[PDB]
Amino acid sequence: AEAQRSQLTSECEKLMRFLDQEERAAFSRLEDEEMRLEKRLLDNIAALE
Amino acid sequence: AEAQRSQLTSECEKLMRFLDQEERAAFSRLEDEEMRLEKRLLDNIAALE
Amino acid sequence: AEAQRSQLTSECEKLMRFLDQEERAAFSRLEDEEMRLEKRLLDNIAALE
Amino acid sequence: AEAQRSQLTSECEKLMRFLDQEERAAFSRLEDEEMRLEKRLLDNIAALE
Structure with missing residues (x-):
């Protein structure tokens, strides 16, 4: 389980x-x-007068 | 001139x-x-195992 | 395990x-x-001349 | 005037x-x-269980 939780947490981070x-x-x-x-x-504005 | 400068400055701001x-x-x-x-x-990642 | 993986994935999302x-x-x-x-x-710039 | 308008426009751009x-x-x-x-x-979340 700790193997999983360590792996899934690191996957989240990555x-x-x-x-x-x-x-x-x-x-x-x-x-x-x-x-x-x-x-x-x-x-465009500068060109208009 | 001040008329211009006031107008062109306000145009900049807008x-x-x-x-x-x-x-x-x-x-x-x-x-x-x-x-x-x-x-x-x-x-997509959750679906892969 | 699937319980964990489902939970840890949803925690990632949240x-x-x-x-x-x-x-x-x-x-x-x-x-x-x-x-x-x-x-x-x-x-500040407008005020300077 | 054109001198002004050219200058004030370039000031706007800068x-x-x-x-x-x-x-x-x-x-x-x-x-x-x-x-x-x-x-x-x-x-902090990983450390909590």
Whole structure:
């Protein structure tokens, strides 16, 4: 049982850490797109008068 | 000139606030997708033995 | 054993969901502080000439 | 006037980009703290039986 509980707990941790990395990267990528969005909009507004 | 500077500054602020809202919503939506991702993966792992 | 594995898996899920909520709230709160930061800085810059 | 508008627009852009960097870093740092939080909690739960 302790064998199981030790294993299932460590599986939980590994799962959570994997998801943390995937999520941290997905964030970075969103921030990248948002910065491109801000640039286009600022330029589009500057061009209008 | 002061008329301009007052106007262009306020335009900056409004732009930044708009982008803040759009970005805050895009975040929420990402967090939603990530939670669905975690659920599917956890279920897929639980089903394997 | 299946009793254990079912229980430990569900504990994993509940832990992950709890952390998801706590983290989503911590984000919201950061975004709040960042918006206050942008306001102060914009005002401080506008005041300088 | 065009001199002003060109300058104030570029100031807007630089401000927004600076805040983007500061904010992206503040995020990274939060994600770091959250990962430490998850580790402590998981360990604290594993220790209880």
